[PDB]
C-alpha cells in the first residue's frame, strides 16, 4: 500500500476491507454544522514529563517515538474518559503548499497536519487499545505556512539522517509542548487510523488553530524519500489519504 496511482487510496480497500467503513478518517469539518456542545471539557495536556527516544522514516513518514512505559506524557479530559499516554507523533503532508492535510475545514486543505497519538492505559499497551472503540485519542493539528516555528526546528535539522525507509536516529529530548497553539478549541467525532490498517478505534481532537511554519522549514519534509536505500528515489510528498463520508456521525465543536 502507498500513496501512488497504484497502491494509493483508492486501492487500499482490497486489502483492508475496512477502508469502507462507517467510522472512516479524515473527514471535511463542516463548521456551520458542527454542533457546539456545552458539555464538553476543556482538553488536559501533560507533556513536561515526555521522553522522547527517536525519530525513524517508516516509508510513509516519520514518527517521532516516545516511552510509553509510565504516564509521562498524557492526554485527558475533553470528550475522553481516562488517560491516554502519548505513543508518537507524525506528520502528513503534500508536494505544494496548496494541499497536505488530511481532515480539513469548510473544504480548506492546509500545508500540512500533525498527528498526536495516544493510547487508553485501561487497556495496558498499544496493541490491545487498536482493538476498541476507544482505544485511541488522536490531536491533530494543522500547520500554515508562514513564520518558522521555533520548536519545530529540532526535527527538520535530523532529518537528513533519516532520508531512507529504515532508517532512524537517537532523538532524545524533544518536547512536543513546542508544537500546541495558543488556543486548545477543538472539534471531536469518531473515527479510524488514516494508513491501514484503518482500524476504527479513535476519538479525533482536531485544533481549531493552526501552527505556522516557514516555507523552508516544509521545504524539508519534501526531501524525504519512501524508497529504501539504494532504490530509486521517491520523494515523500503527499502522503494523506482523501476526506471520506461522515455518514450520520456529528461533529461536535468545544466553542
Ligand atoms: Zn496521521
Known amino acids: 500500500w502507498g500513496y501512488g496511482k497504484h497502491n494509493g487510496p483508492e486501492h487500499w480497500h482490497k486489502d483492508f476491507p475496512i477502508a469502507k467503513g462507517e467510522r472512516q478518517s479524515p473527514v471535511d469539518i463542516d463548521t456551520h454544522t458542527a454542533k457546539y456542545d456545552p458539555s464538553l471539557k476543556p482538553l488536559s495536556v501533560s ?115 533519516i532520508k531512507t525507509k529504515g532508517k532512524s536516529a537517537d532523538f532524545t529530548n524533544f518536547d512536543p509542548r513546542g508544537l500546541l497553539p495558543e488556543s486548545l478549541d477543538y472539534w471531536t467525532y469518531p473515527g479510524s487510523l488514516t494508513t491501514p490498517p484503518l482500524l476504527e478505534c479513535v476519538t479525533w481532537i482536531v485544533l481549531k488553530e493552526p501552527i505556522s511554519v516557514s516555507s523552508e522549514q516544509v521545504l524539508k519534509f519534501r526531501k524525504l524519500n519512501f524508497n529504501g536505500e539504494g532504490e530509486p528515489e521517491e520523494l515523500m510528498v503527499d502522503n494523506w489519504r482523501p476526506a471520506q463520508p461522515l455518514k450520520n456521525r456529528q461533529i461536535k465543536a468545544s466553542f
Open 47 to 161: 507533556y513536561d514529563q515526555a521522553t522522547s527516544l527517536r525519530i525513524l522514516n517508516n516509508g510513509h513518514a516519520f514518527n517521532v517515538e516516545f516511552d510509553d512505559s509510565q504516564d509521562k506524557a498524557v492526554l485527558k479530559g475533553g470528550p475522553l474518559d481516562g488517560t491516554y499516554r502519548l505513543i508518537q507523533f507524525h506528520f502528513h503532508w503534500g508536494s505544494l503548499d496548496g494541499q497536505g492535510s488530511e481532515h480539513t475545514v469548510d473544504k480548506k486543505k492546509y500545508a500540512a497536519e500533525l498527528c498526536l497519538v495516544h493510547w487508553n492505559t485501561k487497556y495496558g499497551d498499544f496493541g490491545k487499545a487498536v482493538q476498541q472503540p476507544d482505544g485511541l485519542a488522536v490531536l491533530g493539528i494543522f500547520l500554515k505556512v508562514g513564520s518558522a516555528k521555533p520548536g519545530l526546528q529540532k526535527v527538520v535539522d535530523v532529518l537528513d539522517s
